[PDB]
Amino acid sequence: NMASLPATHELHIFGSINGVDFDMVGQGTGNPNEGYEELNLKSTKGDLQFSPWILVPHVFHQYLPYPDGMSPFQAAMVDGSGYQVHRTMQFEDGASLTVNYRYTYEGSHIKGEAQVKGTGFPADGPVMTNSLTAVDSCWSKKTYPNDKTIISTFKWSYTTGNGERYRSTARTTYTFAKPMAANYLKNQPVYVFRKTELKHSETELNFKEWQKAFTDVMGMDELYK
After folding, report:
1. CB of 83 within 8 A of CB of 177?
2. b or e along 100-134 (b: 16 or more beta carbons within 10 Å of the residue's beta carbon)?
3. Dihedral, CA atoms, 214, 218, 222, 225, nearest 10 degrees?
4. Would you kindly state where each structural domain of the chain is located, as residue ranges?
5. The domain 8-216: what is its CATH number?
6. How far apart, in whole angstroms, are the C-alpha atoms of residue 164 and residue 22?
7. Cα–Cα distance between 16 and 97 in angstroms, integer?
8. CA distances, 67 to each of 32, 78, 94, 202, 211 (Å)
9. I need a surface site. Which of 129, 150, 176, 219 has the fewest CB within 10 A?
């Protein structure tokens, strides 16, 4: 018997921000019945030369349960066929950031690879000058346009060192190797509430996340934003 939800994970998150290369690796844990995950990361390329906050929320929906059972992400892991993830973020100042994810599974252990490319950050904005201080909690909205796709959308805000909000919008595409169960396509959309904590230096990140999915939710349209 090999049927397993995740208990542990590791992330290799790498790429560039405004052409500057970064690379971080580390181990983490979570509880796939509660939606909790935490992750340690260490840089393999010296001091991050940009706000470490730009890697949140990108630093494993395999830990997210749904209101009534496994999420489609968990079902894809357990079945073994899995899924791929593409995220785009559009920032208020015209900057753009993409992340592509691939996973492999060794029983209850996940190996994540996340490739990041951020461009168009103003040279003196809060990202390149390292003056982001916090994130807002966040609702995501998950839709299923077909049986192999989930589209997720969210508004995102960082706090800056002057106490302003620095805003973006995010679109995430999930591609499933096997069709999702009919029940998922019927009980949509799904809203997920997420809270995060980040402790960081120049070279190290300690990330935590709490998340909970909500189904059958009326007039959530202008409130999740």
Report:
1. yes
2. ebebebeeeebebebebebeebeeebbbbebbbee
3. 0
4. 8-216
5. 2.40.155.10
6. 27
7. 10
8. 13, 18, 36, 38, 11
9. 219
Q: What share of the chain is helix, strand, coil (3-state, %, to 5)?
A: 10, 55, 35
* CB atoms closer than 10 angstroms to residue 175: 12
Residue 95 makes CB contacts below 8 A (sequence gap 6+) with 118, 119, 120, 121, 122, 125, 127
How far is residue 76's CA from residue 119's CA, in Å, rounded to a whole number?
Answer: 32
Alpha helices, DSSP H, located in the chain: 72-79, 182-186
Whether 119 contacts 112, CB under 8 Å: no
Q: How was this structure determined?
A: X-ray
Q: Which of 184, 186, 139, 132 lies closest to 163, judged by CA?
A: 132
**Which are the contacts of 62, defined by CB distance < 8 A and separation ≥ 6?**
5, 6, 9, 32, 73, 74, 77, 103, 110
- Per the structure block, which two tokens stand in for 121? 């950050």
- At residue 102, the 3 state secondary structure works out as strand
Q: Are 87 and 171 in contact (CB under 8 A)?
A: yes
User: What region, left, alpha or beta, does residue 55 occupy, with left being phi > 0 and alpha being psi -120 to 50 degrees?
Assistant: alpha
Q: CA dist 83 to 3, 75, 125, 170, Å?
A: 17, 10, 35, 19
